Amino acid sequence: SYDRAITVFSPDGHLFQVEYAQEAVKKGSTAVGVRGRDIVVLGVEKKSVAKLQDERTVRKICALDDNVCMAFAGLTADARIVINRARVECQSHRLTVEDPVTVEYITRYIASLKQRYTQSNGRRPFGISALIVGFDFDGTPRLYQTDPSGTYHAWKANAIGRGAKSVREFLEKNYTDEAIETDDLTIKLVIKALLEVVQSGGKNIELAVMRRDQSLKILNPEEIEKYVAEIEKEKEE
Amino acid sequence: SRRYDSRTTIFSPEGRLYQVEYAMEAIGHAGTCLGILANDGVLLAAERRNIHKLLDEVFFSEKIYKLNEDMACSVAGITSDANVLTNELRLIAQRYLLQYQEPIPCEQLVTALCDIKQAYTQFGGKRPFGVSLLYIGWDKHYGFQLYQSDPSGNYGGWKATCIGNNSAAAVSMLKQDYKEGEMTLKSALALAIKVLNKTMDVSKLSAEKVEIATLTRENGKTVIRVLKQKEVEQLIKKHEEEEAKAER
Amino acid sequence: GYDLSASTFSPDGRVFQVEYAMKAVENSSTAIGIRCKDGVVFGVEKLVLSKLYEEGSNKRLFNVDRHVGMAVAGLLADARSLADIAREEASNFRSNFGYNIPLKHLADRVAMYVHAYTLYSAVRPFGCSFMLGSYSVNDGAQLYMIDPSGVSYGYWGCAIGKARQAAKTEIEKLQMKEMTCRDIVKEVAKIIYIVHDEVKDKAFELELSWVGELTNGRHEIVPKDIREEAEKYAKESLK
Amino acid sequence: DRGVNTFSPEGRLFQVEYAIEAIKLGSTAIGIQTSEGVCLAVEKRITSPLMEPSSIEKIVEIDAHIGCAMSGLIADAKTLIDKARVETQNHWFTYNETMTVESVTQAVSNLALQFGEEDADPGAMSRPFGVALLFGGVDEKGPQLFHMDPSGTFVQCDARAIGSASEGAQSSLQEVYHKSMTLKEAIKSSLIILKQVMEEKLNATNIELATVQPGQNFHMFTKEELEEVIKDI
Amino acid sequence: NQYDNDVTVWSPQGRIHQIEYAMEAVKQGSATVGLKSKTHAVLVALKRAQSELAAHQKKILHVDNHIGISIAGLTADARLLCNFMRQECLDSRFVFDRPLPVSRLVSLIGSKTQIPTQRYGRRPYGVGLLIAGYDDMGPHIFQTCPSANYFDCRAMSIGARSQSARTYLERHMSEFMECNLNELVKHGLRALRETLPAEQDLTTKNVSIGIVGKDLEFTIYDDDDVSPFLEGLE
Amino acid sequence: SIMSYNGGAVMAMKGKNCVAIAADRRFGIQAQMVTTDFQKIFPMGDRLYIGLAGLATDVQTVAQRLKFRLNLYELKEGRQIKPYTLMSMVANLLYEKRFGPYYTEPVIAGLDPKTFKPFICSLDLIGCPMVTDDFVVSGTCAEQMYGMCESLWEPNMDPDHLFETISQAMLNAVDRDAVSGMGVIVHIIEKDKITTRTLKARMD
Amino acid sequence: RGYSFSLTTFSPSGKLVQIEYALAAVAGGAPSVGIKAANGVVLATEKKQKSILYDERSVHKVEPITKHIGLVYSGMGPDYRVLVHRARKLAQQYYLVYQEPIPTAQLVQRVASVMQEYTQSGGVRPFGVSLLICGWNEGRPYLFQSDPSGAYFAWKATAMGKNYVNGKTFLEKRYNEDLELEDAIHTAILTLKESFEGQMTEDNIEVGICNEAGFRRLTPTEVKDYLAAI
Amino acid sequence: SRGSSAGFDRHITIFSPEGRLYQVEYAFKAINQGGLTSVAVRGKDCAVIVTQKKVPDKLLDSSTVTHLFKITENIGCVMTGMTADSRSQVQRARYEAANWKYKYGYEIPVDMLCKRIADISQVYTQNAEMRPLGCCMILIGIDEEQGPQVYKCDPAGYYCGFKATAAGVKQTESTSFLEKKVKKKFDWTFEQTVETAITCLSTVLSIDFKPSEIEVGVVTVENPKFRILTEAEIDAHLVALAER
Ligand SMILES: *[C@@H]1CC(=O)N(CC)C1=O
Ligand SMILES: *[C@@H]1CC(=O)N(CC)C1=O
Ligand SMILES: *[C@@H]1CC(=O)N(CC)C1=O
Ligand SMILES: [Cl-]
Ligand SMILES: [Cl-]
Ligand SMILES: [Cl-]
Ligand SMILES: [Cl-]
Ligand SMILES: [Cl-]
Ligand SMILES: [Cl-]
Ligand SMILES: [Cl-]
Ligand SMILES: [Cl-]
């Protein structure tokens, strides 16, 4: 079996394979999360359109368990491996603790998987970041982010993928008690955040929500463009 | 030994995987291969490269493989690599069948193989498989289906698609002629011949140079058939008659 | 470059890593062996690199079986490890076959071990050459020499290390076939004193061992009184 | 390109030296050992107001009597912290006593040079850890602070800083430290030093502080307890 | 150059640059001295402190009742080797119910440390040891090197500026065999003191002492416990 | 006895250009009937069937593992397996477990997929094959089954006579066995069709 | 302990150059020909047989795999012996399970699959040979080629080794579907004469045949007889 | 093409753009480093191996300087090329023959032993991590049906049976000499086998040997056990050659 050291230090303390994995994330489709008051929302860009594509087969938002889902940006094949490992683990946890995973537990698990692939022979790092959302047993809503290095943090709102810098800038200005007072405004805050960067807006922003105890709901293109008009005609005033 | 290891499973500075991309160049040169979904079935149509006069003709096809009762695939790229993969698809499909006593759903088969291709891009230090595949099938969850996979270990579902030589051109023609929700096996067959006619521009199309397989349902049972040469000539004839009509 | 791995031939069919390992033996000070009428005697010019070391530190003469001595030159950690291989081989031979390993067989076996380190990028060649000596009534006196390529031959007289050629020419002057071990130790000491470069390297200990009729086929250090007389004979002969 | 276990002509392992350079990319952390206990203080280094500050944990409990502050590549620290935790509980299991700070630090430090590509298991460590660690705690030797870096070298320190601004902070520590200093003085001193060396204006959400005292278990300071101490500083 | 990155690559001069580089790790360590009399073996070490507030690195380690070591080079390699030695000593007492002879332990070190000098992708040990012991053949001082070679010594010094310590030791070594313990340790300290910059002195903070002999199990002396030995340098 | 824990009986019989295979329908655990429609004969081809008696768990596992192997075979080769080749496949499967066998002793009945020539065989539990030109039997009433077959079977029977003979051999054999019966199913295999019948039969 | 990385990788233009270079070793090999008659198959090859000193009988290029299957090759001889050995072993493995001789197509598949492994697996180069494999089963003759990538093709007639391009056109303008085995042997030996250089004897060509009766090498006396007309 | 090279094709056993294995070619050059030549001939009654014996150093025990080896009682061999490689190959051959007898109950045929050693050598031409052995093995024995046999295998893993052959520095010249001599002979077959062998070697080297400068090994139909000639036996042949 192949034992080559793949991720190694360079002069000045860099881990080039990890940095390059981060470059792969930056060329992925934009993905955004906001933590509401009693809802959490994920939206993600595009990716290409293409009328001949079966939409269902290429979603970038994924259930891990009933109370936890995730979006990713970066190498879609890499993600699929991370997603399935996390799904297996949610069932191991439920087996041996008889509670659903906390969002932090599975986040911590994904992150340390990622970290392991930056420090094990024969492997390159995973080329993805993830936004992980759900609710804890006590109803507290959660939004976590992981990156190829295996670092993770909780966020009020965040973006990853191409144009994350400007989308994060927008969220810093627009994330207030007022923008998340209700469910519709939380959802719209995500759509505004994307609509900034999303090329032929929009059209192609896949979106999903999660409510306390309520499990994952994805919005259809009819239900999305309702919110698009309901924000577009508001920005004329 | 560090000196001789070409390091097939590492990132380049822009987050790229060169061997995957290079394998994608191999595929682009291989025989054109297209898939088309209809309401009453799914088809594969492929350019034959085994075309020298002295070849023997011994199997029922060159690039169409049966995977299990309800599915078939075609391939573009390195043939020997494609034999390893199609053998592994058949094994995966029987393992499921053994375990659950129902046929593997189409997407599940595709995903299982793609995870093997993915692994070869992330660890092991080997070259990836130089193959893209089109999968056709029926299952009881989503009916008629068409999938495409490539050496990155990535896949998607399609209503129509193409891999191999002149892919981009073939997809362009499909974008324009394909009717979402309204295609039949007979119209899809016609569109397939149209597309191969345009994309085999070296030179004049012939039944000995293509392979067509259809997957349909009859009496609650999947039927997978490689069209005989008579039917292929007949369809080419109808396409050539149809072009006579074009102007007046 | 064609000289980085023992698994790479050069365009002229050489294996330079084995040759470079030979150069490590050729940088070493000189050891000699002389087979004679009734046994084998070894001598080593043992350079003393600091006066802080004990007499006997960094021995280059080993017992590898009760009947077999080993004399080494080259990288010493490699030589010691080869002495352990030789010991193990002699031990396993006795356990499996029920008698003392014959010298030639021991030589050939250890030589095949040395040889195995000359084929692969995974390992490097041993930086040592060594002699093996024994005596018995049935087999007589035997002296073999093994180099880093794994080649093994038997000798009447032998020398390894940096004054190899000068030593051989002195050894050639002896009619060793008719001499006894008691006579030969004096001549071994004499030859080490001749080939020693007293300007370039300043201080050495003479190391002497033997195996013969007089030790009853056991490989032993030459007793101290006999060594000192041989030294004195050598020194005065240098005159 | 060369192998991960290659020495330089100066007699150092390239990979360990490079890992030591990665420590300098971390946020500053400070430890001080007094006769009344030890304090650990760390700069959080908040990069967006949208980030939850309490999800930056760079001070962690090892056991009730031992805390750990880290700087460098934080994801690398995870397996080290887990190993310290597991080791102190094994020790409790086997011996029915608490493990010394020195002993815990030693056990962790024995992982440091265990990397390489043709000795060990099918995918063992490919490189060293990009992390420095301060273990602060109380055992039968009294209060105690130990530093460890990626070479596996560890040592007791009366006061020590690690990370980006450690030169600087170490200088101020030489100036303020004395053997008979109180814990409360040590807490103020280290908040004063963090305040100097930090790019951001210090406040009660972009730092963490913990103590361990002969009387009392590992204690992370609350926002409120931090605000109290920040008043004078 | 093409010959200096792999322990398996002999240079055209018959050298192995990786082994030579590993030996630099010991030359750059802080100095230590080892010496013996008819009845005792002593180690004396200079401990370096990272800063003015750091303790000072352990340089002297217990191996068994009859054996201790002083180290120079990579501390993590020193511990791994020390743990190997400890284990070899425990095994010998378990099996034979008697102490492992010092020269036999040193042999086991040479054998163990030689192995990685010959396999691709391994590296030498980057540590040198001075080994003090007492057994049936009396007191000993051995030295071990990253080359896997070892030496039986009347006395020795390794580490930064140890040449000076070596020169002192040669100057006085004809006196060592008949010294009482205090005389012998004084000699060790004087040798070690020659390694220091002229400004600096031996103090209770920077000196560590190790002693074993006929009547005395390997004992380490640090901090206040070195003061008896340091007063008398007079 | 392990082989009698579930009870049951299968037989096969040869006729002119046709074959027959039959089985009882009981799934019981020692004295207790659990169900009366348990399948013991499984298709391996349009004109090729395998009947398995013995321990019910192994009846099912062998049928399934066999189908796995046969499906891969057919996909890889151009073609439908020949009867003789199925026998060899099964023998090889059973003999892999030589030292911890499956407790089943199958019978095979079919027509060659190109020549339509009749074939029957049986195997013991470790895979020794036995081909005959008349009949084979397997199960907890093998003696009863042999008595009926030896006395009724005749060469070159047409499909109708073959049906009546195998049916009478099964019914009357199982009616002398406590742990077989609760129904009989019979498959007649011809070139152009399969006829499947359940028989009026004792239910005690 | 073995190199674990592939020694064949994709070039920037999508080529596996080690395989192409293996094909260049095949192209420089001695010529081989195979012709499928209606009632059998013939394999013929040129011995690169210098010296009168060689004992021509001591090693064969035309080799039996089973009673009904045989092989020849162009390219590197020692690589071929590996594949002969594996092919034999694969044929017997099949026979133990199915108790029927391996069909020719199934044997080719399994051998071709071994050749594929050596284009991907760690620390090895591809085989520098192409095989021509003949057989008879289901009452019918087969002729296959297997190349260094592990790709295989069924031929009516072909040529490989030095001067194969010309040999193939020589057969193109000379093979018919209804042709007999004895005539095929004749045209196979002529195809070799097209590129021979040396004057042919029964000691420097090797011929094997395959039909209902099975696979075998022709004896030197049989070859001599076919050589009289040429 | 024509001496072209890409990548690591001169350092390890991968194909060059012409489809060559340079490392294998270099192993053949390694055979000549030793500076020796060996010759082997077969007739109806016997097979003979002759090689040079160079003892330049007087201090060598010349009884330990040989390139002739017994493999089994009935199979002998001469090795040419790198010495330690050769010894390794000899041990392998001894192991293969002994193993064959134990498993199959009859002696390994010479052809089969040669094929086995050639197949083992093949592996070194296809796997990258070890070099080929820089040596060449010639085997003699009697086969019960075919008579005396001479076989040779090389670092490429090629092998063949021969009427006569050679190895080392003067192989080509020996091959020339031997070819010229068999064409003359009726049924292309040697008859004075020991003399042809020594004469070949003497011509291609221009030496006229003393009996201590060659070694000679034989097997015969009447005496199939491998036998090495003494100095006196060789001398008789050298004298009988000198006198016509
Ligand atoms: C071995 C012998 C010696 O003097 N050194 C230098 C550091 C060693 O390590
Ligand atoms: C005939 C050929 C040969 O080798 N010998 C043995 C000496 C003969 O007599
Ligand atoms: C052995 C038999 C033969 O004819 N050849 C071709 C030169 C051999 O190598
Ligand atoms: Cl893992
Ligand atoms: Cl990002
Ligand atoms: Cl199926
Ligand atoms: Cl299925
Ligand atoms: Cl020498
Ligand atoms: Cl630091
Ligand atoms: Cl040090
Ligand atoms: Cl260190």
Ligand SMILES: [Cl-]
């Ligand atoms: Cl040294």
Ligand SMILES: [Cl-]
């Ligand atoms: Cl030093």
Ligand SMILES: [Cl-]
């Ligand atoms: Cl199975």
Ligand SMILES: [Cl-]
């Ligand atoms: Cl490797």
Ligand SMILES: [Cl-]
């Ligand atoms: Cl074979």
Ligand SMILES: [Cl-]
């Ligand atoms: Cl067969």
Ligand SMILES: [Cl-]
């Ligand atoms: Cl034959």
Ligand SMILES: [Cl-]
């Ligand atoms: Cl035997």
Ligand SMILES: [Cl-]
């Ligand atoms: Cl003659």
Ligand SMILES: [K+]
């Ligand atoms: K090789």
Ligand SMILES: [Mg+2]
């Ligand atoms: Mg009944």
Ligand SMILES: [Mg+2]
């Ligand atoms: Mg009843």
